[PDB]
Design a protein around this motif. Structure first.
Motif, PDB file in Angstrom:
ATOM      1  N   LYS A   1       0.841  -1.187   0.000  1.00  0.00           N
ATOM      2  CA  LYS A   1       0.000   0.000   0.000  1.00  0.00           C
ATOM      3  C   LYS A   1       0.878   1.239   0.000  1.00  0.00           C
ATOM      4  O   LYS A   1       1.846   1.312   0.759  1.00  0.00           O
ATOM      5  CB  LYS A   1      -0.928   0.001   1.218  1.00  0.00           C
TER       6      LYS A   1
ATOM      7  N   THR B   1       0.961   5.618   0.094  1.00  0.00           N
ATOM      8  CA  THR B   1       0.210   6.748   0.632  1.00  0.00           C
ATOM      9  C   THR B   1       0.894   8.049   0.248  1.00  0.00           C
ATOM     10  O   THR B   1       2.026   8.293   0.672  1.00  0.00           O
ATOM     11  CB  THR B   1       0.090   6.655   2.153  1.00  0.00           C
ATOM     12  N   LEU B   2       0.189   8.884  -0.526  1.00  0.00           N
ATOM     13  CA  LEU B   2       0.661  10.189  -1.017  1.00  0.00           C
ATOM     14  C   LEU B   2       1.898  10.056  -1.899  1.00  0.00           C
ATOM     15  O   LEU B   2       2.757  10.939  -1.904  1.00  0.00           O
ATOM     16  CB  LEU B   2       0.933  11.175   0.130  1.00  0.00           C
TER      17      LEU B   2
ATOM     18  N   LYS C   1       4.190   0.999   2.061  1.00  0.00           N
ATOM     19  CA  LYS C   1       4.062   0.044   3.151  1.00  0.00           C
ATOM     20  C   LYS C   1       3.835  -1.348   2.590  1.00  0.00           C
ATOM     21  O   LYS C   1       2.964  -1.542   1.738  1.00  0.00           O
ATOM     22  CB  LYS C   1       2.912   0.425   4.080  1.00  0.00           C
TER      23      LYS C   1
ATOM     24  N   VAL D   1       3.444  -5.340   4.120  1.00  0.00           N
ATOM     25  CA  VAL D   1       3.360  -6.265   5.242  1.00  0.00           C
ATOM     26  C   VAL D   1       3.327  -7.689   4.696  1.00  0.00           C
ATOM     27  O   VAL D   1       2.665  -7.967   3.690  1.00  0.00           O
ATOM     28  CB  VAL D   1       2.159  -5.934   6.151  1.00  0.00           C
TER      29      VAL D   1
ATOM     30  N   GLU E   1       2.808 -11.471   6.047  1.00  0.00           N
ATOM     31  CA  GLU E   1       2.361 -12.303   7.152  1.00  0.00           C
ATOM     32  C   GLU E   1       2.523 -13.776   6.797  1.00  0.00           C
ATOM     33  O   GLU E   1       2.206 -14.191   5.681  1.00  0.00           O
ATOM     34  CB  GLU E   1       0.905 -11.990   7.478  1.00  0.00           C
TER      35      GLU E   1
ATOM     36  N   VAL F   1       1.683 -17.477   8.500  1.00  0.00           N
ATOM     37  CA  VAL F   1       0.982 -18.198   9.558  1.00  0.00           C
ATOM     38  C   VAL F   1       1.361 -19.669   9.489  1.00  0.00           C
ATOM     39  O   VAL F   1       1.320 -20.280   8.417  1.00  0.00           O
ATOM     40  CB  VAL F   1      -0.538 -18.013   9.432  1.00  0.00           C
TER      41      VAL F   1
ATOM     42  N   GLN G   1       0.288 -23.275  11.017  1.00  0.00           N
ATOM     43  CA  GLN G   1      -0.763 -24.001  11.715  1.00  0.00           C
ATOM     44  C   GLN G   1      -0.401 -25.475  11.817  1.00  0.00           C
ATOM     45  O   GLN G   1       0.481 -25.970  11.122  1.00  0.00           O
ATOM     46  CB  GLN G   1      -2.111 -23.845  11.010  1.00  0.00           C
TER      47      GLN G   1
END
Lengths: 58, 58
Positions: free
Chosen positions: A12, A14-15, A20, A22, A24, A26, A28
């Motif tokens: 993402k 911004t301006l 950004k 991220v 992730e 996981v 399990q």
């Protein structure tokens, strides 16, 4: 029990500066029941026994 | 120049614990050109002048 893995990423901005990202990941746990059986000569009359070895390795 | 404001929020949960909430608030600048004009008696023959006051306040 064994483990499996997801990996999700989105980005993402911004301006038009300040990007950004991220990421992730996981982990399990997947479960399973097992039932091990074993055959025994209970009829007392076989023709041939079958599968002539009994040695193991882990 | 004036400023305006966005506010974006989204929430994400991972493995039913560990709730993540990010709240982003972007402030941008909106611009505008203005041109102020003013009228002058240039025809020398008015009937009535008009708008009889000339005092200001900021």
């Amino acid at each position: 029990e064994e483990g499996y893995n997801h990996l999700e990423c989105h980005r993402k901005c911004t301006l038009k500066v300040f990007c950004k990202t991220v990421c992730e990941d996981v982990f399990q746990v997947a479960k399973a029941e097992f039932r091990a059986f074993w055959c025994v000569a209970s009829s007392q009359v076989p023709e041939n026994s079958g599968l002539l070895f009994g040695g193991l390795f882990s």
